[PDB]
């Protein structure tokens, strides 16, 4: 099947140009589809920006008049978006999506890439480990945590044991404070597996090329 | 432009039950070629919108037959024969008959399931954060239903509201429960000036609040 | 005739993507030419990056393998350059140029746009006026000056009286000091026209959206 | 890749005189269609490269006939019947026969004209720069020929070399002269500790150096 994948900056400064790329696999872009760029704003409102179909024909929403350009590179099977003079209003989640030109079916969207328009400077995050106490290390199960504080811009991808520990995990949406994001995450396992088996918090923050691990070690005696 | 009006805004449904949502366009969507470019999409929590219905009433590629689109002219309806846990998320209608193509406002489907009390856990600041001059007391309330829940912080018996930050996860697409994290941030000095730190949760699953706490110096 | 004009960022940070645009006027891009992107490095060495011809066909130098993409927007009659994972080595002057596909004649280049790959932060310039003394305000002619110090990145466009005073002008190449550029400019007029007629130094610095004027007033008594 | 070797590296010529430069390719440039994709370009100071010769020996669009390209195989020559002031700049050859297309190293043509002494001017720091904690003494030496020139700074008679920065303009494409600016930067304090500031220029147009100076407190 067809699969799309977006890539681009996560942060762009006011008045600059936004440049995004969408790599397509499993189908030639010069056949059948309409390759669209759609964005989703904070309140979850969706807006169609435009497309370029299999024959290279383009069409874009008038709400973006003279600021948008959609091109393609048939050699690398990718299409692009160029948005000039961005302002904080352009902050949203950008998606690429292909729908069949003829009837609009077999539509496939990429994962989306967050784009922030701000003057604020990129700040790496701090990762603090959250170990329980001794009253919960004696019972049914155990909950461990990971605190990621003060970073910018979004997002950060967080995993436990580099991704092998997926179940019993909860990563909460980040909250903006002091122009810095804070996000927490908890993982739950059997009260008899930890600390026998190390549990590590892996935090990644693209905007600043940061990647730090944080092992969850027991408080007090170790 | 052609405006797409969706209703209801939100909607709660028991698992194994049918559902039905509306999308009304301010302009006819059938074009001169007999086709009606109208699509229905489902955006599960954390995912991107995915296909369901195309051509107004046609089941899209690989979509469970439980979904059925219908209607013509300006009134379109999406139906689900029997809701499943993974059907939760926001449904959107999208018209491709009139340039510029526009989406509806979306309709949020909440899954209805049995009540579930929260598993609460509390965490003192980390040694590392402390040496940095900060202090955060984190409390987790996981896998509960319904979404409504009230958490209260108490420092040595007195309620504390300032410096508290909360964050909720969307309904889980597997068990249909909700989770939340409450965080109390204080200056290292104010933190070390007190001893008792409590996290109080009130939820319809118990008339008496769920309490979790700790005192500095112990574990 | 055909005329090209480049536009794009003046500063880009390491590991990011460079995105440039070339607007073409006086001829359709879907006819006859080969639309090239060429760059010139500090020592004045030229390198051919690639092209996209009238039919949309592309070709790029292997020295940029998998980092370059050249597309076009026939609607706005523009073509573009996308260069991924730039490093300080990519710092150069980027030009767009069209040559006839068939024989290589009627070639036309744009003015060029300076591109700097650095971590250094954008800094607006300081503009100090340079008035003579009283020993040269009594003689043949008179020379006035304008000092532009400590800015980044290049360039700054400098003019006298918003561009009406063009003759007898000398704007010297900037010199990099403390990761900050310094540039001076002198203008010469009849020893009897100034200060009867105000002379102003107009300094513009895109990278920081700065535009400041500096009138040249006589020292001491005024 | 096909390497293009240009010679000489630089070159000086009197106005009204002929010139001739070479470009040698490491590989034949004639292709299977009888064409030789070889172009000659002139990049005047501050401008972008501009067309001259195409197809190895063909006068390009709107180019003065004074320019003539010739040669075949791997040896190509550019000739100028009689140099004019605006012919100064760097000449480049560019081959489009072998992918990837490459340019030669360029050849710089300097114009020969009558000697011309420099018009020197000196400038004390500005009130504004002073209040900022800085001090720059700027000196200009405009429209001189030849390019060779030596400027010396003296603070109260003593030579000062540290903190001096110079910048020269390329040969002027109209009068063929050169210009230069010399700047002495000092701390506000060191500047206010001295009185005499002199700018000394030595150039073949006078055996005695051109001197310009000023003393704080006057004008
Ligand atoms: C933009 Si869309 C892929 C499309 C949009 C919404 C619903 C179904 C199809 C299609 C493209 C071809 N037409 C002729 O432009 C009609 C709209
Ligand atoms: C890249 Si160019 C416009 C060219 C380059 C240098 C000199 C003359 C022509 C030309 C394009 C068509 N071919 C067949 O690729 C040969 C080179």
PDB file of N, CA and C in Angstrom, chain D residues 128-171:
ATOM      1  N   UNK D 128      28.866  59.353  19.321  1.00  0.00           N
ATOM      2  CA  UNK D 128      28.016  58.203  19.586  1.00  0.00           C
ATOM      3  C   UNK D 128      28.802  56.948  19.920  1.00  0.00           C
ATOM      4  N   UNK D 129      29.799  56.636  19.100  1.00  0.00           N
ATOM      5  CA  UNK D 129      30.605  55.452  19.356  1.00  0.00           C
ATOM      6  C   UNK D 129      31.328  55.611  20.688  1.00  0.00           C
ATOM      7  N   UNK D 130      31.784  56.827  20.970  1.00  0.00           N
ATOM      8  CA  UNK D 130      32.480  57.073  22.217  1.00  0.00           C
ATOM      9  C   UNK D 130      31.616  56.687  23.411  1.00  0.00           C
ATOM     10  N   UNK D 131      30.433  57.290  23.520  1.00  0.00           N
ATOM     11  CA  UNK D 131      29.550  57.003  24.648  1.00  0.00           C
ATOM     12  C   UNK D 131      29.256  55.512  24.809  1.00  0.00           C
ATOM     13  N   UNK D 132      29.555  54.729  23.780  1.00  0.00           N
ATOM     14  CA  UNK D 132      29.318  53.294  23.836  1.00  0.00           C
ATOM     15  C   UNK D 132      30.505  52.533  24.415  1.00  0.00           C
ATOM     16  N   UNK D 133      31.614  53.238  24.626  1.00  0.00           N
ATOM     17  CA  UNK D 133      32.803  52.615  25.182  1.00  0.00           C
ATOM     18  C   UNK D 133      33.817  52.199  24.131  1.00  0.00           C
ATOM     19  N   UNK D 134      33.610  52.647  22.895  1.00  0.00           N
ATOM     20  CA  UNK D 134      34.526  52.297  21.819  1.00  0.00           C
ATOM     21  C   UNK D 134      35.159  53.503  21.154  1.00  0.00           C
ATOM     22  N   UNK D 135      36.194  53.260  20.360  1.00  0.00           N
ATOM     23  CA  UNK D 135      36.895  54.332  19.670  1.00  0.00           C
ATOM     24  C   UNK D 135      37.533  53.849  18.380  1.00  0.00           C
ATOM     25  N   UNK D 136      37.053  54.354  17.251  1.00  0.00           N
ATOM     26  CA  UNK D 136      37.612  53.979  15.955  1.00  0.00           C
ATOM     27  C   UNK D 136      38.027  55.207  15.161  1.00  0.00           C
ATOM     28  N   UNK D 137      39.275  55.199  14.698  1.00  0.00           N
ATOM     29  CA  UNK D 137      39.811  56.285  13.889  1.00  0.00           C
ATOM     30  C   UNK D 137      39.869  55.733  12.475  1.00  0.00           C
ATOM     31  N   UNK D 138      39.026  56.263  11.595  1.00  0.00           N
ATOM     32  CA  UNK D 138      38.964  55.793  10.218  1.00  0.00           C
ATOM     33  C   UNK D 138      39.698  56.685   9.236  1.00  0.00           C
ATOM     34  N   UNK D 139      40.434  56.058   8.323  1.00  0.00           N
ATOM     35  CA  UNK D 139      41.192  56.784   7.315  1.00  0.00           C
ATOM     36  C   UNK D 139      40.911  56.204   5.916  1.00  0.00           C
ATOM     37  N   UNK D 140      40.608  57.078   4.955  1.00  0.00           N
ATOM     38  CA  UNK D 140      40.317  56.644   3.589  1.00  0.00           C
ATOM     39  C   UNK D 140      41.384  57.070   2.582  1.00  0.00           C
ATOM     40  N   UNK D 141      41.716  56.168   1.664  1.00  0.00           N
ATOM     41  CA  UNK D 141      42.686  56.448   0.612  1.00  0.00           C
ATOM     42  C   UNK D 141      41.966  56.051  -0.681  1.00  0.00           C
ATOM     43  N   UNK D 142      41.332  57.022  -1.333  1.00  0.00           N
ATOM     44  CA  UNK D 142      40.555  56.722  -2.535  1.00  0.00           C
ATOM     45  C   UNK D 142      41.138  57.008  -3.913  1.00  0.00           C
ATOM     46  N   UNK D 143      40.690  56.209  -4.878  1.00  0.00           N
ATOM     47  CA  UNK D 143      41.067  56.325  -6.276  1.00  0.00           C
ATOM     48  C   UNK D 143      42.531  56.458  -6.599  1.00  0.00           C
ATOM     49  N   UNK D 144      43.300  55.417  -6.310  1.00  0.00           N
ATOM     50  CA  UNK D 144      44.722  55.441  -6.595  1.00  0.00           C
ATOM     51  C   UNK D 144      45.136  54.279  -7.482  1.00  0.00           C
ATOM     52  N   UNK D 145      46.282  54.437  -8.132  1.00  0.00           N
ATOM     53  CA  UNK D 145      46.828  53.397  -8.983  1.00  0.00           C
ATOM     54  C   UNK D 145      48.328  53.584  -9.046  1.00  0.00           C
ATOM     55  N   UNK D 146      49.090  52.484  -8.972  1.00  0.00           N
ATOM     56  CA  UNK D 146      48.639  51.093  -8.826  1.00  0.00           C
ATOM     57  C   UNK D 146      48.188  50.673  -7.432  1.00  0.00           C
ATOM     58  N   UNK D 147      47.632  49.464  -7.347  1.00  0.00           N
ATOM     59  CA  UNK D 147      47.099  48.874  -6.112  1.00  0.00           C
ATOM     60  C   UNK D 147      48.042  48.908  -4.918  1.00  0.00           C
ATOM     61  N   UNK D 148      49.336  48.791  -5.179  1.00  0.00           N
ATOM     62  CA  UNK D 148      50.321  48.788  -4.111  1.00  0.00           C
ATOM     63  C   UNK D 148      50.334  50.098  -3.330  1.00  0.00           C
ATOM     64  N   UNK D 149      50.167  49.995  -2.016  1.00  0.00           N
ATOM     65  CA  UNK D 149      50.161  51.168  -1.154  1.00  0.00           C
ATOM     66  C   UNK D 149      50.354  50.708   0.287  1.00  0.00           C
ATOM     67  N   UNK D 150      51.099  51.485   1.064  1.00  0.00           N
ATOM     68  CA  UNK D 150      51.372  51.161   2.472  1.00  0.00           C
ATOM     69  C   UNK D 150      50.920  52.278   3.420  1.00  0.00           C
ATOM     70  N   UNK D 151      49.998  51.954   4.323  1.00  0.00           N
ATOM     71  CA  UNK D 151      49.510  52.933   5.280  1.00  0.00           C
ATOM     72  C   UNK D 151      50.061  52.625   6.662  1.00  0.00           C
ATOM     73  N   UNK D 152      50.486  53.671   7.364  1.00  0.00           N
ATOM     74  CA  UNK D 152      51.042  53.539   8.712  1.00  0.00           C
ATOM     75  C   UNK D 152      50.323  54.447   9.724  1.00  0.00           C
ATOM     76  N   UNK D 153      50.030  53.924  10.917  1.00  0.00           N
ATOM     77  CA  UNK D 153      49.370  54.715  11.964  1.00  0.00           C
ATOM     78  C   UNK D 153      50.338  55.157  13.046  1.00  0.00           C
ATOM     79  N   UNK D 154      50.190  56.401  13.488  1.00  0.00           N
ATOM     80  CA  UNK D 154      51.031  56.957  14.546  1.00  0.00           C
ATOM     81  C   UNK D 154      50.197  57.661  15.618  1.00  0.00           C
ATOM     82  N   UNK D 155      50.361  57.230  16.863  1.00  0.00           N
ATOM     83  CA  UNK D 155      49.660  57.830  17.991  1.00  0.00           C
ATOM     84  C   UNK D 155      50.695  58.644  18.762  1.00  0.00           C
ATOM     85  N   UNK D 156      50.620  59.966  18.622  1.00  0.00           N
ATOM     86  CA  UNK D 156      51.566  60.871  19.262  1.00  0.00           C
ATOM     87  C   UNK D 156      53.005  60.557  18.832  1.00  0.00           C
ATOM     88  N   UNK D 157      53.190  60.326  17.532  1.00  0.00           N
ATOM     89  CA  UNK D 157      54.508  60.043  17.000  1.00  0.00           C
ATOM     90  C   UNK D 157      54.939  58.589  16.955  1.00  0.00           C
ATOM     91  N   UNK D 158      54.410  57.761  17.849  1.00  0.00           N
ATOM     92  CA  UNK D 158      54.770  56.345  17.890  1.00  0.00           C
ATOM     93  C   UNK D 158      53.896  55.506  16.955  1.00  0.00           C
ATOM     94  N   UNK D 159      54.523  54.602  16.205  1.00  0.00           N
ATOM     95  CA  UNK D 159      53.802  53.743  15.272  1.00  0.00           C
ATOM     96  C   UNK D 159      52.924  52.736  16.003  1.00  0.00           C
ATOM     97  N   UNK D 160      51.711  52.543  15.496  1.00  0.00           N
ATOM     98  CA  UNK D 160      50.774  51.606  16.093  1.00  0.00           C
ATOM     99  C   UNK D 160      50.302  50.629  15.035  1.00  0.00           C
ATOM    100  N   UNK D 161      50.492  49.336  15.295  1.00  0.00           N
ATOM    101  CA  UNK D 161      50.090  48.297  14.348  1.00  0.00           C
ATOM    102  C   UNK D 161      48.956  47.406  14.848  1.00  0.00           C
ATOM    103  N   UNK D 162      48.876  47.199  16.155  1.00  0.00           N
ATOM    104  CA  UNK D 162      47.828  46.353  16.710  1.00  0.00           C
ATOM    105  C   UNK D 162      46.477  47.049  16.736  1.00  0.00           C
ATOM    106  N   UNK D 163      45.428  46.308  16.398  1.00  0.00           N
ATOM    107  CA  UNK D 163      44.097  46.881  16.403  1.00  0.00           C
ATOM    108  C   UNK D 163      43.761  47.615  15.120  1.00  0.00           C
ATOM    109  N   UNK D 164      44.618  47.472  14.117  1.00  0.00           N
ATOM    110  CA  UNK D 164      44.403  48.105  12.824  1.00  0.00           C
ATOM    111  C   UNK D 164      43.783  47.101  11.849  1.00  0.00           C
ATOM    112  N   UNK D 165      42.774  47.544  11.110  1.00  0.00           N
ATOM    113  CA  UNK D 165      42.091  46.696  10.140  1.00  0.00           C
ATOM    114  C   UNK D 165      41.937  47.433   8.806  1.00  0.00           C
ATOM    115  N   UNK D 166      42.326  46.768   7.720  1.00  0.00           N
ATOM    116  CA  UNK D 166      42.271  47.347   6.381  1.00  0.00           C
ATOM    117  C   UNK D 166      41.339  46.600   5.427  1.00  0.00           C
ATOM    118  N   UNK D 167      40.847  47.314   4.422  1.00  0.00           N
ATOM    119  CA  UNK D 167      39.945  46.729   3.447  1.00  0.00           C
ATOM    120  C   UNK D 167      40.095  47.473   2.135  1.00  0.00           C
ATOM    121  N   UNK D 168      40.291  46.722   1.057  1.00  0.00           N
ATOM    122  CA  UNK D 168      40.466  47.301  -0.272  1.00  0.00           C
ATOM    123  C   UNK D 168      39.297  46.953  -1.179  1.00  0.00           C
ATOM    124  N   UNK D 169      38.985  47.859  -2.095  1.00  0.00           N
ATOM    125  CA  UNK D 169      37.908  47.644  -3.059  1.00  0.00           C
ATOM    126  C   UNK D 169      38.582  47.078  -4.297  1.00  0.00           C
ATOM    127  N   UNK D 170      37.860  46.278  -5.076  1.00  0.00           N
ATOM    128  CA  UNK D 170      38.434  45.717  -6.298  1.00  0.00           C
ATOM    129  C   UNK D 170      38.662  46.896  -7.239  1.00  0.00           C
ATOM    130  N   UNK D 171      39.417  46.686  -8.306  1.00  0.00           N
ATOM    131  CA  UNK D 171      39.652  47.762  -9.242  1.00  0.00           C
ATOM    132  C   UNK D 171      38.300  48.315  -9.719  1.00  0.00           C
TER     133      UNK D 171
END
